[PDB]
Design a binder for this molecule. Structure first.
Ligand code: HEM
Length: 153
């Protein structure tokens, strides 16, 4: 449910992410992990990362953050008619990776925090509100696909 206006504010601020996808991605995962330490346990390759410093040095963490936001940008660019891009992600996240809807909320918070921290001037009240609705739409559609597949939404 976003207006055309809100989608344009989302994709305008996503333009900033697109100019450095891996750096934003690495910051999002570090914020996720440092705010909610338990999420780190879903990534078997990152169990030895015992500090923010180790996290910043990890080339695999930065690659995973890049892969994550490149996929999320693909979903945002479809503005809601994103069923095709969303399904495989809910499939893998519900079945292979075992990621609960709650962690999708934590990572939504980390994305907003990263955007606010890196682009304070470009991420004013209207852009923030629209990005919150866009990520809420992503979470709600992920939740609904989880239900369809027989999992908890
Ligand atoms: C904005 C939300 C997210 C996006 C767009 C996203 C995207 C992706 C993509 C594109 C992949 C690789 C392809 C695939 O397996 O589907 C992936 C893998 C993975 N994701 Fe996510 N993800 C998100 C949130 C999460 C969260 C919150 C967690 C757990 C805290 C998580 C855990 C994982 C794991 C464990 C893998 C496999 C990595 C490996 O094999 O080492 N994801 N994710």
């Amino acid at each position: 449910g976003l207006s055309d206006g809100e989608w344009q504010l989302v994709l305008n601020v996503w333009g900033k992410v697109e100019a450095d996808v891996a750096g934003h991605g690495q910051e999002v995962l570090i914020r996720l992990f440092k705010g909610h330490p338990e999420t780190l346990e879903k990534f078997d390759k990152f169990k030895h990362l015992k500090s923010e410093d180790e996290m910043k040095a990890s080339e695999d963490l930065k690659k995973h953050g890049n892969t994550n936001l490149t996929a999320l940008g693909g979903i945002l660019k479809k503005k809601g008619h994103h069923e095709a891009e969303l399904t495989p992600l809910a499939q893998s996240h519900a079945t292979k990776h075992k990621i609960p809807v709650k962690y999708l909320e934590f990572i939504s918070e980390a994305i907003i925090q990263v955007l606010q921290s890196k682009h304070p001037g470009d991420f004013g009240a209207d852009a923030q509100g629209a990005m919150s609705k866009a990520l809420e739409l992503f979470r709600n559609d992920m939740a609904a696909k989880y239900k369809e597949l027989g999992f908890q939404g």
